[PDB]
Design a protein around this ligand. Structure first.
Ligand SMILES: Cc1ccc([C@@H](NC(=O)[C@@H](F)c2ccc3c(c2)CCCC3)[C@@H](C)C(=O)O)cc1
Length: 293
């Protein structure tokens, strides 16, 4: 599964306004590469990778000239350092979560103005088409999404009235969502990823405070267990997994837009500061793929 030359890509984000940055971190030498800007600035987007291509999904352009929720899907090819537009989603989705199953991108939840989506749709890259699938049991903006064992998990978020500790799982062969065990902590805007047999939820916002706590859901035992907390509390953070470790990037803590990047080692149950982003920002999309040419 591991291979050389993979970078952690961070796209978009927010600081004073929505951002167009695409930057890639190399854990093997600690360097950051500045790559081609997004065609449209966006925060609250999600990033994912299919077939070596990086996709930026949804979000919102918060600019001095207005606030526009995004239905856009855009594809970055590291071999060309170019972004290419794809077919748009059926609805704008800010503060979205995405997951990849069998080469298809699932776009989950998000907001459009005051509308809080429970709807979900799936993108087929070979056909460049989106199609709706079964909606979630709960409306979720700021939802964390991860895929484990070809099952799709939607974790936490905000339904428009309450931030959520609930979570649910999508079973593709049944086109059905079912609730799973609720988290120990209410979390909107948490970083959600998969490591070994567990879904991790790191940080987020409980309606009062941004969080440094981290918990993981064992899909076998169906229990949530706290692990070591991050050094810096953060919500609306970027997250990914690389070579058996969790990386959290940026976010907002109620006082600062963080540039901090922390790395979690599950064998030692410890977080370590590895690098800083070029500037502090929240609401980024993050994914791992091969380095550009
Ligand atoms: C991508 C994303 C996901 C979830 C959120 C949630 N909010 C936070 O997580 C909150 F902690 C926060 C975070 C960033 C910022 C602020 C406040 C205020 C200043 C601007 C940046 C939203 C749904 C909520 O629960 O209301 C926001 C954004």
């Amino acid at each position: 599964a591991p291979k050389v030359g993979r970078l952690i890509y961070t796209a978009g984000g927010y600081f004073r306004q929505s951002l167009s940055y695409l930057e890639a971190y190399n854990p093997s030498d600690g360097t950051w590469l500045r790559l081609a800007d997004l065609q449209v600035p966006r925060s609250g987007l999600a990033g994912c990778v299919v077939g070596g291509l990086l996709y930026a999904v949804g979000g919102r352009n918060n600019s001095p000239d207005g606030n526009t929720d995004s239905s856009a899907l855009d594809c970055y090819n590291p071999m060309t350092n170019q972004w290419s537009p794809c077919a748009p989603m059926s609805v704008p989705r800010n503060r979205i979560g995405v997951g990849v199953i069998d080469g298809h991108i699932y776009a989950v939840g998000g907001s459009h103005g005051c509308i809080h989506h429970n709807s979900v749709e799936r993108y087929e890259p070979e056909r460049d088409e989106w199609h709706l699938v079964a909606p979630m049991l709960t409306r979720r903006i700021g939802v964390g999404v991860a895929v484990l064992n070809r099952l799709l998990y939607a974790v936490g978020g905000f339904d428009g009235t309450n931030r959520l500790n609930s979570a649910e799982c999508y079973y593709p062969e049944r086109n059905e969502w079912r609730m799973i065990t609720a988290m120990n902590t209410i979390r909107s805007g948490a970083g959600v990823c998969v490591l070994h047999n567990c879904i991790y939820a790191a940080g987020g916002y409980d309606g009062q405070d941004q969080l440094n706590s981290v918990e993981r859901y064992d899909v076998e035992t169906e229990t949530w267990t706290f692990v070591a907390p991050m050094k810096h509390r953060r919500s609306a953070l970027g997250i990914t997994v690389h070579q058996g470790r969790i990386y959290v990037l940026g976010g907002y803590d109620g006082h600062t837009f963080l540039d901090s990047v922390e790395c979690y080692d599950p064998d030692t149950d410890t977080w370590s500061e590895v690098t800083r982003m070029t500037s502090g920002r929240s609401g980024v999309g993050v994914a791992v793929t091969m380095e550009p040419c």
